[model samples]
Each structure stands twice: as structure tokens, then as C-alpha cells.
Target: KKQFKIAVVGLDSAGKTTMLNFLRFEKNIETLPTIGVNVEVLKRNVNLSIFDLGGLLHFRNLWGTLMKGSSAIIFVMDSADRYRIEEAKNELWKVLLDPNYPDAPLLIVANKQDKEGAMSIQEIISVCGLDNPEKLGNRSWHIQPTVATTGQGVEEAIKWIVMELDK
Candidate 1:
């Protein structure tokens, strides 16, 4: 089996680190802000390397560079925080348009879906420009509404990501 690397990005406090933690220390469940970038390796039948990048403005500059050599990208967004939703979309677009990330399999995780007042899937697609599926090279952009805190949809997200990587 071939090894695949996946990078995760988004606005600040979008549950990027939490997802990383779940993938790494699956038992910890501790949440903390990332400094810059955290790398986690999962040793399974197929090695999976994860690059969890910080979501704050200061750290976004590293996304383009990291996107290179990645087989897939996971863009995390907090569904409950409507205020930062637009910002997250813009930031994700910046990463996608970066010359370094062409043709990369994209997965948008609408995290914090369990929270009250969370945006619906359609609202998120419209807001994040995932509504036009053809614009993304006919590649089905996997958008999973998940509650990272409860590990809901976490493994499923990873499984879909791996499937895309293999394809």
C-alpha cells in the first residue's frame, strides 16, 4: 500500500487541533491550540501521515507550502460559529487556489454540528461555494457535518479521505 499525506486547515478554533488529536491520541480527547503545525503518523496497513496546520492568520502562510506533496486536504469549519464561516471559506479558497495545491482531493469538515444553531448542510455548501460541484473538477467535495467532540463522523471522514487518496 502507498503512503498518503493529508493536510488540515481552516480559521482559528475550527476544531482542527481537536481532529488531529482524535487521529493521533485517540484516547486523549484533550483540546489545545496548535502553535504552527503538528504532524501525526498513523501506522496501519497503509501508512497515513497527517499535517495539522494552525488556523490563525499568522499561521496561514504555511498552508501553501504544506499543501504541496499532500494527497488530500481537509478544511475544517465550525458550523455553530456563523460569524467566522465566511472567513473560513475565504481562507480555504486561498489554499485551494494556491499554485501548490492543484488537483488535490478536498474534504470540508463542518465540525461542531452538534452545537445548537449550527448551519445546515445546504447553508454551508452555499456559503462555502461547495454548491457548484462542477467547479471542483467534477470531484465530489466530501462535506461531512460532524461533532468532533463526540468522535462522530471523525473516522468516517478519515475513511473517505483515504478512499480519495487511493483513487
Candidate 2:
């Protein structure tokens, strides 16, 4: 049996919830804004464990309590929220520092690409220090532009996971 363990983490309003719904076919089950973290375990040909991390300011600190067993991390970035990018960068740095998080492939989800003033891929790489080995540690990383609401770029993101895990 194959199990894909994934953790979807980001700052608040980065569209984690919407993307989770998009992947799981939960369109009719309206979920409220994530007040706490959400975990979904799907049983199928391949079991999947997806942790939809909470993004609210207060909820940020709570992420590390469980200590990740994830093979992949989806770090969603709100591309249009330039001002908050720095904070996200700082937060991501901290997340990587968690001893229990282990060395996992990071799939940087440059979300909200359709929004006006959205940051470009080059700009995201520059701002978030994705290219910096010192900041990101020993991990394979890829950036995928996404419009979570439309499920754009999601297939590529999942493909990235499949590819990275098989390595």
C-alpha cells in the first residue's frame, strides 16, 4: 500500500482551505474558515494524509505541536499580498527549523496568481529566498503558480509530489 503524507501550510488567507476542498471533491460540503487545524486521511488505492494547517496569527504557533511526519510540504503564498510576504518568509524559516519537521520536499504554492499585483515567480523566489541553500536546507523545492479557486496548476503540484517522493 502506498501512502502519501502531505502537509499544506501557509499564513492566513493563503487559500489552504479552498485548495483542500478542490483536491478532495468537497464542493458541496461548505467548510467555515479554519479556526483550528484540519487533518484528512483518505483511504483508497493509495492512502493519503493531508494536514491543512491553520493560518491565523494565533494558530501559527500551534502548528509544530504535532511534529510533522509528512513527506512533502506545500507552502502556500498569497501572491498579491506583497506586504505580508516578509512575514511569510520569516514564518517559513521557522517552520523549516522545527526539529521534528524533518527534511522534506517543499512545493511552494504561489497562489492567487490571477489577482492583480500578484508577485511573479522570479520575484517570489527572490523575496522568499527559495534559491538560498542556507535558508531552505537540504530539500528539493519547486514553485508552482496557482489559482486555487480554479484548481489551476494543482495537477502540476501533485505531479511534483509524486515525482519528488519517488526519488
**Poorly placed runs, candidate 2 (over 4 Å):** 26-31, 42-45
TM for candidate 2 is: 0.89
lDDT score for candidate 2 against the true structure? 0.81
Give the alpha carbon lDDT tens digit for every residue of 44-99 in model 1: 45777888887778878878876668888899999999988888888877876676
Q: How large is the C-alpha RMSD of every model relative to the true structure?
A: 1.7, 2.2
TM-score of each: 0.91, 0.89
lDDT of each: 0.81, 0.81
In model 1, the clashing pairs are: none
